[PDB]
C-alpha cells in the first residue's frame, strides 16, 4: 500500500504456519502481551481481527541471534552509574538481571537521582529498587514499540486501543500525487523511509552529472559514474502508484548514503503518509455526526487528497476445440464507433480514456453450429449474416473502472515468447485513474481517529478564520473524549504552533516553562518541522507556553488564543460563531478504503453453476448475501412475501428469475415464485 506497509510486513513475526500453531488451537494466552516482549516484539502493532496476537511486529532496536532468540540492547550499569557500553541480552538473560526504565533521572556523570527507581523484574514485576541494584537500563524510550508505532506523536497520551488502530491504519495510507511531510513528527519518519527501500539513496559520494525525470547520474570522486533509474508510475501489488521523483539538481555535491530521490509517501526523505490540514473541532449542522468528516472543496480543486491508482487487465488467445481464439479489430455486430479507440490489432491505444464497458482487447472465439439457440439460429437467418461462427469474448472494462490507458504489453507464441501450452497471444493493459477525494472516502489520523467523508462543502461554506482563510476539515467534538486519544488534540495545538511559529520572551531570563526545552526551540519560523519522540517529546507545560507566544500573521494579528481556540465565522450566514473553537493543523492520511472501489450494485448477472445462486464478490459482479440473521429479521417483521421473494425469484429460481425479468420489461405483475433449485440439489444429495 505504502512504503511503511512493506517495511512492516518484512519485520512481521507470525505464530501461524507449519511448525507453529493452528488458529483453532490457540487460546487467549498465546495472543496477549508477555513481559519478555519488552524491546523485542511490539505490544501495540497487531491486527484486531481473528489474527490478533498471532501476528506481531519486531521492536525497533531488536535483533535476532544465530540461535533464534530475539536480543535487545541495554546500557550496562556498573555501580549505579549509567555507562555508554551497550550489550544485547536475550529473554532469559534479561530475567537474570533488573533493568531501569529509559526515562530515569540521571546525573550528568551517570548516577541515578533517586535511590528508588521504577525497575522491571522477572515475571513482569514493576517496583522501586535501590540505585545500587540497577544492572542495566533501556536504550531509548521507544525501545518497546515497532517502527510504525514509534511514528505516532504524543503516543503516551493515547490509549492502546486507538494506538493500535493508528499504527495499523498508517500502513493503509495511499500514496498521493504530491506528498507533504508532517509538521508534527517523531523523527522516525526519516529512517523508516530510507530503510523501507522505496527511495533512491546515493551509494558513493560525488556530484550530479546529469539529472532527468528518467534517471540520475552521479560522478564519483575516483572517476566512476553510477546511474540510478527512476521507477515512474509503476503499479504496486495493491494498485497504488509507486512513483519516484528526483530531488537533487545538476551539479549538487551529495554525500554517501543520502537521499537523491524519493518515491511514494516521501517528502525530502521522510514518510509522508498524508497532508497537513487546517482542522476545527466543532459540530457543523450534523454533517459530522459520530465520526463523519466534513471537507473543504479546496482539497478537490488543488489535488491535496488526489491519488493515482493503476489496475492491471489481462486476457489471452488460446487454441479451442473448433479453432483458435484470435485478437482482432474485426468483431461481429459492433459499430466502427466503439472500435474507434482500437489500433489495427484490436488493442486499445495508449492515452485513450476508457469508461466501464469499453473494449480493451478484441478477442473472438469460434462457436460451433450445434451450440446455437433456436432463436439465435432464426435470428441469424433473419439477418443474412453468414460466416459469423465466432462470438464476442473481448476484454471489457469492469464496472467501476475508468481512466487513461498508460501501457500495453503483448506476448505472442509466434514471437518466441514462451506462453503456457495452449495459448497463442497474451495482452496486459495498464489503466491509470486520477482519484480525487470523494464523498465516503475513508480518512484517518495517526491516533486511531477514523471516519468517512460525509460532506464536501464549497470553500465559501466552510467556517473561516478572522483573515478569511477557511478551514480544510471539520472534526466532530463528541468523538474525542470517548476514545481517550487526546494526542490528536495535542497534535492540533503543536500543529498550529509549527504553522505559525513562536518567539519566547528572552528578556528577564528564560521563562520557567521553557527551561527544559532546547535552545533551538526558543524561536521558530512559520511552517517549521518538529519531532515528538514516543514517550519523550513535548510536555503540556511547554505546549501551553507555546500557544501564548504564537507568531502573528502577515497583518500582525494573532488568530488563536493562548487556550488554543480561535474565533470562526459561519460561512453560510455570516454571523461569527458564538464561542471560540480549537483550530490548528493535523496530519490526515488517505486510507485505501475508497468508495470508488467499495461501491457495488447488481440487477442480474452470473450465477454459480452448481447452486444456481448469484455469484459472490464485486469482482465477479455478484449480489449481496441475505444471510441467516437477515432472514430472522424478515420473520420478526412478518414480511412473508419479501422473504419468499428474496429466497426464490431473486436468487436460485431458475425459471422464476427469467419470468420476473420479462414481467418487468413487459410491465406485467410479478409472477408466483417456484421451487428453489438449491432445494432440488439437497434432495439429490440426500439420495
Amino acid at each position: 500500500n505504502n512504503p511503511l506497509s512493506g517495511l512492516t510486513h518484512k519485520r512481521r513475526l507470525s505464530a501461524l504456519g507449519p511448525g507453529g500453531l493452528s488458529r483453532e488451537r490457540a487460546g487467549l494466552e498465546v495472543r496477549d502481551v508477555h513481559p519478555s516482549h519488552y524491546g523485542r516484539m511490539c505490544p501495540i502493532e497487531t491486527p484486531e481481527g481473528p489474527n490478533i496476537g498471532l501476528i506481531g511486529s519486531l521492536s525497533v532496536y531488536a535483533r535476532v541471534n544465530p540461535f533464534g532468540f530475539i536480543e535487545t540492547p541495554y546500557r550496562k550499569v556498573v555501580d549505579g552509574v549509567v555507562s555508554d557500553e551497550i550489550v544485547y541480552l536475550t529473554a532469559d538473560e534479561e530475567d537474570r538481571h533488573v533493568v531501569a526504565q529509559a526515562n530515569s533521572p540521571i546525573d550528568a556523570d551517570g548516577r541515578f537521582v533517586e535511590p528508588r527507581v521504577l525497575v522491571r523484574r522477572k515475571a513482569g514485576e514493576v517496583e522501586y529498587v535501590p540505585s545500587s541494584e540497577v544492572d542495566y537500563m533501556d536504550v531509548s524510550p521507544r525501545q518497546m514499540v515497532s517502527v510504525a508505532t514509534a511514528m505516532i506523536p504524543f503516543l503516551e497520551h493515547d490509549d492502546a486501543n486507538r494506538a493500535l488502530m493508528g499504527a495499523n491504519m498508517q500502513r493503509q495510507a495511499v500514496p498521493l500525487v504530491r506528498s507533504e511531510a508532517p509538521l508534527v513528527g517523531t523523527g522516525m519518519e526519516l529512517r523508516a523511509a530510507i530503510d523501507a527501500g522505496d527511495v533512491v539513496v546515493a551509494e558513493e559520494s560525488g556530484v550530479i552529472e546529469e539529472v532527468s525525470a528518467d534517471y540520475i547520474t552521479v560522478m564519483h570522486d575516483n572517476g566512476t559514474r553510477r546511474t540510478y533509474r527512476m521507477r515512474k508510475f509503476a503499479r504496486s501489488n495493491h494498485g497504488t502508484c509507486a512513483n519516484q521523483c528526483p530531488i537533487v539538481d545538476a551539479g549538487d555535491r551529495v554525500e554517501a548514503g543520502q537521499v537523491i530521490a524519493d518515491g511514494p509517501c516521501t517528502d525530502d526523505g521522510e514518510m509522508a503518509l498524508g497532508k497537513n490540514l487546517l482542522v476545527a473541532i466543532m459540530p457543523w449542522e450534523g454533517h459530522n455526526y459520530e465520526d463523519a468528516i466534513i471537507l473543504s472543496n479546496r482539497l478537490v480543486e488543488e489535488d491535496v487528497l488526489t491519488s493515482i491508482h493503476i489496475e492491471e487487465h489481462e486476457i489471452d488467445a488460446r487454441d479451442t476445440k473448433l479453432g483458435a481464439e484470435e485478437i482482432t479489430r474485426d468483431i461481429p455486430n459492433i459499430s466502427d464507433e466503439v472500435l474507434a479507440d482500437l489500433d489495427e490489432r484490436g488493442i486499445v491505444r495508449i492515452g485513450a480514456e476508457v469508461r466501464d464497458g469499453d473494449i480493451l482487447v478484441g478477442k473472438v472465439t469460434p462457436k460451433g453450429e450445434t451450440e446455437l439457440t433456436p432463436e439465435e439460429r432464426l435470428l441469424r437467418a433473419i439477418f443474412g449474416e453468414k460466416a459469423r461462427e465466432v462470438r464476442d469474448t473481448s476484454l471489457k472494462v469492469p464496472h467501476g473502472e475508468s481512466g487513461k490507458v498508460i501501457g500495453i504489453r503483448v506476448f505472442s507464441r509466434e514471437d518466441e515468447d514462451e506462453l503456457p501450452a495452449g495459448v497463442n497471444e497474451l495482452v496486459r493493459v495498464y489503466v491509470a485513474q486520477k482519484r480525487k477525494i470523494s464523498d465516503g472516502d475513508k480518512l484517518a489520523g495517526r491516533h486511531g481517529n477514523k471516519g468517512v467523508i460525509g460532506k464536501i462543502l464549497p470553500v465559501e461554506d466552510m467556517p473561516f478564520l478572522a483573515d478569511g482563510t477557511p478551514v480544510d476539515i471539520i472534526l466532530n467534538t463528541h468523538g474525542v473524549p470517548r476514545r481517550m486519544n487526546i494526542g490528536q488534540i495535542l497534535e492540533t495545538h503543536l500543529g498550529w504552533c509549527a504553522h505559525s511559529g513562536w518567539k519566547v520572551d528572552a528578556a528577564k531570563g528564560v521563562p520557567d516553562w521553557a527551561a527544559r526545552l532546547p535552545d533551538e526551540l526558543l524561536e521558530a519560523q512559520p511552517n517549521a518541522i518538529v519531532s515528538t519522540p514516543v514517550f519523550d517529546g513535548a510536555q503540556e507545560a511547554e505546549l501551553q507556553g507555546l500557544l501564548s507566544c504564537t507568531l502573528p500573521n502577515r497583518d500582525g494579528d494573532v488568530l488563536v488564543d493562548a487556550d488554543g481556540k480561535a474565533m470562526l465565522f459561519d460561512g453560510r450566514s455570516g454571523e461569527p460563531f458564538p464561542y471560540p473553537v480549537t483550530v490548528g493543523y493535523m496530519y490526515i492520511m488517505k486510507l485505501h478504503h475508497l468508495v470508488d472501489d467499495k461501491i457495488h450494485a447488481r440487477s442480474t448477472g452470473p450465477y454459480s453453476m452448481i447452486t444456481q445462486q448469484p455469484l459472490g464478490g464485486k469482482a465477479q459482479f455478484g449480489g449481496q448475501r441475505f444471510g441467516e440473521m437477515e432472514c430472522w429479521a424478515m420473520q420478526a417483521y412478518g414480511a412473508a412475501y419479501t422473504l419468499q421473494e428474496l429466497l426464490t425469484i431473486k436468487s436460485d429460481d431458475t425459471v422464476g428469475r427469467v419470468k420476473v425479468y420479462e414481467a418487468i420489461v413487459k410491465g406485467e405483475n410479478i409472477p408466483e415464485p417456484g421451487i428453489p433449485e438449491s432445494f432440488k440439489v439437497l434432495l439429490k444429495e440426500l439420495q
Binding site: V60, Y61, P73, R75, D84, I86, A102, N103, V139, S140, P141, A181, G185, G187, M188, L190, R191, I194, V201, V254, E255, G257, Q258, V259, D268, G269, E270, R516, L517, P518, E520, L521, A524, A528, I529, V530, S531, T532, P533, D536, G537, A538, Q539, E542
Partner: peptide
Amino acid sequence: SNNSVPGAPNRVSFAKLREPLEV
C-alpha cells in the same frame, strides 16, 4: 537537531534524553 547523519532536513526534536545507540 534530529538525525544529523545522512544530510536530511533539519527537524527539531523536543528531546530531553540522548540517544545512546542509533536505530
